Symmetry: D2
Subunit: 330 residues, 4 copies
């Protein structure tokens, strides 16, 4: 019976009752490739993982039979798809799982930067008897008006359009940018489209990031692109870790080029405010890689990722996979 | 020349140049009425106050030359408009100053409750190693999906429509209750309207107040209405704070009947978090009466109040005031 | 029992079994005060009319006490409310009845003017071979792009907001002008508000009227105002008829100052297309006063009028009515 | 550069001054391909067509020096892309121009059916005196309320999206059907997605077609699918013709199984109401294939087409073209 792993899992109680008989779901609870067991590394047909354990070219052959790797999530950047596509390993993922959640959390980070609700709550929990109206503006100094602030968006993916759809009502003027979309969407959703990155950086006040991390955009917003940002433009990042540089963003925050920046995923997981380059950065919000989560987007991505193992444990691989992301498979 | 006394503020550097020639502006900076200078109480004809000092009839009858009270904001509930009009004191206000900002900071409250982006930032400031994806769900246990929830707006004026317009895009099925509103505008915006609280609290996964406190809405959400909300339904209150029994909302939070509640204004300002009726409440966000503020909205709001006294120290009161609020003088 | 007229109706079908118990509905099908019978003049408690009969100060006094008149529809300009207010007669309308069918029809007119769909269907039912792509362009010559026009709504009540909500998605940039609205209704919906009619007519590619015809705007768009309109801007009147000049608009059409005009009402109804001041004007759409009709807009306003004549037959006068439109009695 | 033809046109006015230094544009006026030439047909270089002259396998073989085809439309059904690649020819189209016009004519064909602002204008262009409201309710008997109807649009591509953005404000509830989209698009715009076409026709008060016409779409609407539509649901075809079996749509109207149909293209073009399979159908509005036209989109698509041929006669085989088609190229 085809043992199906749950590599970085401890809770297999949604993938069990639908893989109850086709396979023996058995987690590994790993945090490193050298923390999986020999039983799984020698007999585990499929392995649904999460966004924490990272597999590399030299780890995909550290298995003995790995027909499929389902990524319970919207992004396959921690799996070397080009190695799996030649090691006889298809790599699925659940793209549509949390799109109305990443977009809500992103359009909430933008409002938490513009209106300073999180900083106000935090400065009210530290204790601040803010009573006089001259004493309110000194605790909300910077809370800007939204109507008419051009919103960059580096990439109309599924979760890039889902933010341009609900940020057009707040008054934002959206202008996306990504070179891989066909001439198109810019017209059907009613957003301007800039063709080169310098433009999106030069004419945007709240540059966001919604692009999947491939090998051509690693460290997209480094020190060289930050100097192209408008003077005092927020920077929300809910896409992926190695996308925005860290030392450079900290530098830009300390000086003042960035009037605030609410990262949501960091270059070093798990993030904390006591280690790393952002140790002393001002005007910085960070959530612990929680914009994909809800009570119904987990129950929907785990279910739909176990249904993906079901399809690959009976059907032909990879011609019976609803979401494979390497058709460079052999 | 007439004296125009700003009641609570050490800053008059926006309305001074707009009111330089006509009158002589002179701030008073009074956290209460017992700090008004005798000059600015015996010789001031016009007077603009923000929201902190509250003029009652026993107090509005002490100014002996006052002829207009420009109320900076959408408030005027801390000014006894009946008594004011009975003393020849026309009260106006600036209603359109911060609408696109109260609505934007009310939507952010609704999203900070549904996705918990300010309880996660806290848990990261308190220090929490959120490493394993089993711990992500334990630190964010409660974050919900928005598409489908029914947002119920008690009050559909300006700040109520401005939230229905921008919450219809997140999938929030909007629903409102407004008795004083001449029917036929739930048709334009496209939102179902209900006709009684017992019929709005009953179907609303996130009730948000947007009414103006008058002599008939005090403690609208009291101990008797919270027993009509759903079994767990967020409550946002970015509108004047004498609308929720704080001795009955904290009794519902510490019990689980309300799954969190972001209050923007309270009954007692300032709002020292450790002091008050809800000192020990769980799942509670509070900003300090700061949805109205913006570098641009706190300037349009003051220039347009200077311009209002420029019209009252020159025109016929109250037939010259652009938007007076007590034409019962 | 009290008699409840139906001054111009000939159905009294939906209104019959709502007040049959406590009133005897009876229709008259009149077109003037020259058709009503003697006893149903002075004592007839209530009457409910449509937009076809015009009652005047010199007519309502032929009714001693119409304890109520109910104006099925949304406009109460047929009856002198200032006259009824002095003869103990309270006027009522049904405002919320067809607020969105009027907006859908007004958007349909604005799109018929831009895309020329009903000028192309009419040029096909008239016979035209449109084979070559040159003739496609010479027959639909005038159709314009919509994204980036400045639709200007003269009047921002219910039917104005309902169009500003619907036309903000087509790319229009709404710009209204309303002198009676309080400050702020332009900040909630996000539509730039201009304050003087010249300032709305200068910057507008469509000037669609949505104001109720009161005493102070009869013939609002006359020759003088049309001379202020932008060179070649459409004009969609879907409001009361006597609001826009006939002769002046026909002049502006035949001349070129107006690139089309879809009028849903006219100065003199029933509007025939061969007798009138618009006898030979080019580029007109017209509809026979039908933007309020549906299979549901009727059952919602007729029932609502039948309910208004109950609320006004068991309860006291206008302090027990719902949509009273002249509180000016005493 | 060699002669670039303009097969389907008599006017090369904006294509030329952009191509004046590269090649010498000429035209052919071919209403059919056997009407082009014996010398251009031999050795031009390439071409740029419109949507009337169809080029088939046996006909593309007739050209002897064809490098590139450049449609000036949005679709390329009238060219055997699958055969043109095997022949040595690259095919290209201007994909995103008049996306804002097809989706403004489709939201007008949809309101022209729910409000009948083009049948009311017809019936009033024939002399239907309508003063009594009991007669207005007759001339417009059939107009319906929109808020609630479930507009179900086949093919959520580039205009299928631009229509679901415009018709989410009228109250429509949009649901699409598309089997070639990588799932996750129904959640960015908030439109419920159905998976089988029967599941789109069983719940749609107004079905609208927005799909390509490749090979598995011919007569998507048969006598076998119309039997699956709601009892009297409109049908708006503003896509390529050959998706609606006219012989079946001419029955579905003469019985009431379809309460209206706003076709914009047709099986055989040109179109006229006196020769065809639907010569006598009631409730049938049809425009002559001008849902794509404007004064700006018909200048944008025929400049982008003259730029995509400059890039193709200066660049390379389909590695320099921007919007190339036919991965069947060698
Ligand atoms: N906060 C979270 O934890 C969370 C949750 C869900 C998704 N995500 C991330 O969001 C990312 C985007 O999600 P998605 O649904 O849009 O994936 P997607 O494949 O559907 O869309 C990504 C699009 O980004 C554009 N793009 C690609 N490379 C680019 C580049 N170098 N520069 C600019 N644009 C580029 C492309 O147009 C791509 O289509 C995912 O990779 C995923 O990792 C994060
Ligand atoms: N967070 C802040 O500091 C802030 C900023 C701006 C406004 N506000 C408050 O928000 C309130 C609303 O602002 P606004 O611009 O909408 O004023 P508004 O008068 O235009 O809107 C009030 C609407 O609620 C209706 N209403 C009255 N009593 C009601 C009741 N008992 N139940 C339900 N509805 C009732 C009112 O008739 C009206 O429809 C203002 O009183 C203002 O004090 C607060
Ligand atoms: N096509 C139809 O048959 C049809 C259907 C419904 C309504 N209508 C007409 O549409 C009119 C408007 O409908 P409504 O429900 O919005 O009425 P409404 O009273 O609800 O709103 C009308 C708004 O226009 C304002 N206004 C008044 N005079 C003005 C002027 N001189 N210039 C600019 N604005 C002015 C009014 O103050 C108000 O703000 C109604 O009077 C009604 O007669 C026509
Ligand atoms: N009225 C006009 O003259 C006019 C103007 C512009 C475009 N069009 C036509 O409209 C069509 C759509 O335009 P577009 O820009 O969206 O093309 P597109 O390729 O961008 O979008 C087409 C979408 O429909 C999908 N589809 C394919 N077959 C399908 C099927 N059997 N059922 C359901 N969906 C299917 C396609 O995969 C795609 O998702 C074009 O083919 C074009 O020919 C017509």
């Amino acid at each position: 019976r085809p043992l199906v792993a749950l590599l970085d899992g401890r809770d297999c109680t949604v993938e069990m009752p639908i893989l109850k008989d086709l396979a023996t779901v058995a987690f590994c609870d790993a945090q490193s490739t050298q923390e999986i067991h020999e039983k799984v590394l020698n007999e585990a047909v499929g392995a649904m993982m999460y966004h924490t354990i990272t597999l590399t070219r030299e780890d995909l052959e550290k298995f003995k039979a790995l027909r499929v790797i389902v990524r319970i999530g919207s992004g396959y950047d921690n799996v070397d798809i080009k190695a799996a596509g030649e090691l006889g390993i298809a790599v699925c993922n659940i793209p549509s799982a949390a799109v109305e959640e990443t977009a809500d959390s992103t359009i909430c980070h933008i409002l938490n930067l513009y209106r300073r609700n999180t900083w106000l709550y935090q400065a009210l929990r530290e204790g601040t008897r803010v009573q006089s109206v001259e004493q309110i503006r000194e605790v909300a100094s910077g809370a800007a008006r939204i109507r008419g602030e051009t919103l960059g968006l580096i990439g109309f993916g599924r979760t890039g359009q889902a933010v341009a759809v609900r940020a057009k009502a707040f008054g934002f003027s959206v202008i996306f940018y990504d070179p891989y979309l066909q001439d198109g969407i810019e017209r059907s959703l009613g957003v301007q489209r800039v063709y080169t990155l310098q433009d999106l950086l030069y004419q945007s006040d709240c540059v966001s990031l919604h692009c999947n991390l491939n090998e051509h955009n690693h460290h997209l917003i480094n020190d060289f692109t930050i100097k192209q940002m408008r003077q005092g433009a927020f920077l929300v990042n809910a896409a992926r870790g190695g996308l925005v540089d860290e030392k450079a963003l900290a530098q830009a925050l300390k000086e003042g080029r960035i009037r605030g920046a609410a990262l949501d995923v960091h270059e070093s997981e798990p993030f904390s405010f006591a280690q790393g380059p952002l140790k002393d950065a001002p005007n910085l919000i960070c959530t612990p890689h929680t914009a994909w989560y809800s009570e119904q987007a987990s129950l929907e991505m785990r279910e739909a990722a176990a249904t993906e193992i079901r399809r690959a444990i009976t059907g032909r691989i990879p011609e019976s996979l609803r979401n494979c992301v390497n058709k460079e498979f052999f």
